[PDB]
Amino acid sequence: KVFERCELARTLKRLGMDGYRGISLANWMCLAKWESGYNTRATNYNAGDRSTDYGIFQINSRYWCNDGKTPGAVNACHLSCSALLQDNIADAVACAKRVVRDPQGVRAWVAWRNRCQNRDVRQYVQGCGV
């Protein structure tokens, strides 16, 4: 499903993402925006290394979820990548929390560095009542 901005903002706060491992809600919104356009069904095949990015946070199959076709991959979130394509984002959120528990933190996603880091991200949560 494609979330509306504020709808997603409120959902993420209820799922405990605000300030998770030091990452503000506005940063998570900036990330979801640039990764999928707030679309839970988005997938991106990376022909270069044969891995696929899944869902709203575009989580990669090489380390986080299992899709069976990615060479030498692990499944740290202990989830089928299918779980990351549901309309209910609970599993995607639990996995995203797992990703940021690693040393890189939110820097794990290159898109965050390009379009969110050191920018004014307040705009993503403005007027949503969170």
Q: Which is nearer to Na ion, 5 or 50 (CB)?
A: 50
Residue 60 engages Na ion in binding (rule: CB under 5 A):
no
Residue 61 engages Na ion in binding (rule: CB under 5 A):
yes
One-letter amino acid at 16 equals: G
Selecting among 35, 67, 87, 120, the annotated active-site residue is: 35
Q: Which is nearer to Na ion, 27 or 75 (CB)?
A: 75
**Please, what's the b/e burial string for 86-118 (b: 16 or more CB within 10 A of its CB; e: otherwise)?**
eeebebbbebbbbbbeeeeebebbeebeeebee
CA atoms of 2 and 37, how far apart (whole Å): 8
Residue 75 engages Na ion in binding (rule: CB under 5 A):
yes
In angstroms, what is the minimal distance from the CB of 51 to Na ion?
Answer: 8
